Design a protein around this ligand. Structure first.
Ligand SMILES: C[S@@+](CC[C@H](N)C(=O)[O-])C[C@H]1O[C@@H](n2cnc3c(N)ncnc32)[C@H](O)[C@@H]1O
Length: 449
C-alpha cells in the first residue's frame, strides 16, 4: 500500500479533480487503455468522461467500479444526514452499496447511454465479496468515449441528460471545425428545413456530401468523394457569424438529413459506407428513425419514408431508442404511421426474426405504458392487434409471469391506460382480447377491468 502511488496514476489518466487519497485502484484497472477528458457538451457543469487512448477490442475488461462501501441501511442513513447527497455515483451490488461520489477510480468517469452504450457492468468476485467489472460490449476506436447503461434512479435521465454519442469529445465546435477545415465550406440555406430548426439564409458549414444531400443529387453518381465526409456533421453558425458550440445547438449528420428528406438511395449509400445509423442529436434526441417518422408525417409520397424504415431495420438499427417522453420507436410509429404502414413496418421486423420480441414490449413510457398499453390509451385498436399478432406471449410474459410484483404493476398500468374508455370502447377491447388466440384466463380479464 506504501507501494501504490495514486498521484502518478491520476497524472497518467489526466485526472485533475481528485485527491490522491480519494483514488482507489483495483488490480485489474487498465489505465494504459483509457483516459479522462472533459466532455465539451458538459462544459457548463465541468463534466468529464472516460475515453479510449487506443483501439479496444470488444469484451475487454477496463477495471472494477471501486468506491466507499456501505450496507443498504448505512447508505440510506448517509443520504439522510448529508445534505445534497444522491445516488449519482452509487451502485447497488451484492447486497451492498458502492458509492464513488467522493472516492473511486477511473470507472467513476464513465457517462450514461441506454442506446449507444459500448460497455457494461458485469458482476465479479473480489476477496469473497461481489462487485462490478466494466467490460467493453463492442470495439472502441481510439478517442471515442466509453458509455454505459445503468439505473439512474431519481435523476430523470430521459428528461434532463444529453443524448451522448461515442464521438462526443473534448473539442469545441470551433476546434472541431479547424481540425476538418479542408472538408468544410460555409453555405447559406437554399430553403427552409424545419426538421433541423433551419430557415432559408441561415449559414451552415457543410461538406461536399452535405451539399449533395441538400441538392437532392445522388451520392452514388459522384466519383470523387472523400471518406471523411461520410459522417462529418453540418455545423450551424449563429447570427453573430460565430460557430454554434455543441451545447448551444444540435448538429446533424448526412444520414440524418437524407432520412428527413426521404432520399432512399442516398440513405442506402450512406448506410453501406459506415454512417452511424443510431446517432442522436445531443439536446433533441432526434435520430435517423425519428427524423424518418417526421419526414413521413409531412410527406406527399409516404412510401419512400417506409422504404427508409425498412432499410434501417434491415441494418439492425436500434429500435429501442427513445425520446424524452420515454417513447420508443414503436411507441411513436403507432401514432404517426397509418394502419397499413404500421402493419407493414411490424411485418419488416417480423422478417428479421428477432430473438427477444419481449424486449420491445418491455420499455414503458413516462405514463408507465408499454407499446400495447400505449395503443389502447390512444384508441388505436387495430395497431394493438398488429402488435398482439406480432407477439402472442405478450400477456403471458408480462401479466402472468413468476413475478407477481411485476404482474400487478402491468395490470394496474393497463387499467390506467383504459381508465377513460366509454361504454362501447371497453367492449370492443374485450371482444378482440378473446378472438385474439391469446387464451386469457377469466380472472385476468377481470382484474384488468
Ligand atoms: C458516474 S458520473 C459520470 C462521470 C461525470 N461526468 C464526472 O465528470 O464525474 C454520472 C454523472 O455524470 C453526469 N452524466 C452522466 N451521463 C450523462 C449524460 N448522458 N448527460 C448529462 N449528464 C450525464 C450526471 O451528472 C451524472 O450524475
Amino acid at each position: 500500500d506504501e507501494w501504490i502511488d495514486t498521484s502518478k496514476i491520476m497524472l497518467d489518466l489526466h485526472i485533475d479533480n481528485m485527491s490522491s487519497s480519494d483514488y482507489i485502484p483495483s488490480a485489474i484497472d487498465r489505465t494504459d487503455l483509457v483516459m479522462v477528458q472533459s466532455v465539451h457538451l458538459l462544459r457548463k457543469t465541468g463534466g468529464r468522461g472516460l475515453f479510449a487512448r487506443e483501439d479496444i477490442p470488444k469484451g475487454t475488461c477496463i477495471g472494477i467500479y471501486t468506491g466507499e462501501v456501505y450496507s443498504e441501511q448505512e447508505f440510506e442513513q448517509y443520504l439522510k444526514e448529508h445534505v445534497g447527497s444522491d445516488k449519482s455515483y452509487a451502485m447497488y451490488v451484492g447486497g451492498r452499496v458502492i458509492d464513488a461520489a467522493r472516492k473511486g477510480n477511473l470507472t467513476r468517469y464513465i457517462n450514461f447511454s441506454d442506446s449507444q452504450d459500448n460497455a457494461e457492468f458485469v458482476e465479479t468476485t473480489l476477496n469473497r465479496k461481489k462487485v462490478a467489472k466494466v467490460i467493453t460490449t463492442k470495439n472502441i476506436k481510439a478517442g471515442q468515449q466509453l458509455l454505459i447503461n445503468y439505473n439512474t434512479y431519481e435523476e430523470q435521465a430521459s428528461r434532463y441528460y444529453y443524448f451522448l454519442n461515442p464521438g462526443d469529445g473534448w473539442l469545441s465546435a470551433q476546434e472541431f471545425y479547424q481540425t476538418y477545415q479542408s472538408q468544410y465550406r460555409l453555405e447559406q440555406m437554399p430553403y427552409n428545413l424545419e426538421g433541423f430548426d433551419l430557415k432559408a439564409g441561415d449559414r451552415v458549414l457543410m461538406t461536399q456530401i452535405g451539399r449533395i444531400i441538400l441538392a437532392n443529387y445522388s451520392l452514388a453518381k459522384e466519383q470523387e468523394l472523400n471518406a471523411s465526409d461520410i459522417d462529418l456533421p453540418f455545423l450551424k453558425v449563429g447570427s453573430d457569424e460565430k460557430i454554434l458550440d455543441f451545447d448551444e445547438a444540435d448538429t446533424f449528420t448526412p444520414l440524418m438529413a437524407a432520412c428527413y428528406l426521404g432520399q432512399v438511395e442516398n440513405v442506402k449509400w450512406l448506410i453501406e459506407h459506415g454512417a452511424n445509423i443510431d446517432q442522436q442529436q445531443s439536446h433533441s434526441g432526434h435520430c435517423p428513425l425519428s427524423l424518418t417518422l417526421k419526414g413521413y408525417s409531412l410527406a406527399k409520397d409516404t412510401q419512400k419514408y417506409i422504404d427508409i424504415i425498412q432499410l434501417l431495420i434491415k441494418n439492425q438499427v436500434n429500435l429501442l431508442v427513445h425520446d424524452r417522453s420515454d417513447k420508443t420507436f414503436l411507441h411513436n410509429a403507432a401514432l404517426v404511421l397509418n394502419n397499413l404502414d404500421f402493419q407493414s413496418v411490424v411485418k419488416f421486423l417480423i422478417g428479421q426474426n428477432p430473438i427477444d420480441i419481449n424486449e420491445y414490449f418491455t420499455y414503458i413510457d413516462e405514463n408507465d405504458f408499454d407499446i400495447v398499453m400505449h395503443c389502447y390509451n390512444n384508441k388505436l385498436f387495430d395497431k394493438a392487434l398488429v402488435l398482439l399478432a406480432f407477439y402472442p406471449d405478450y400477456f403471458k410474459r408480462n401479466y402472468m409471469s413468476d413475478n407477481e410484483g411485476h404482474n400487478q404493476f402491468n395490470i394496474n398500468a393497463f387499467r390506467k391506460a383504459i381508465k377513460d374508455f366509454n361504454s362501447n370502447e371497453r367492449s370492443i377491447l374485450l371482444m378482440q382480447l378473446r378472438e385474439s388466440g391469446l387464451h386469457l384466463p377469466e380472472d385476468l380479464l377481470e382484474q384488468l377491468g
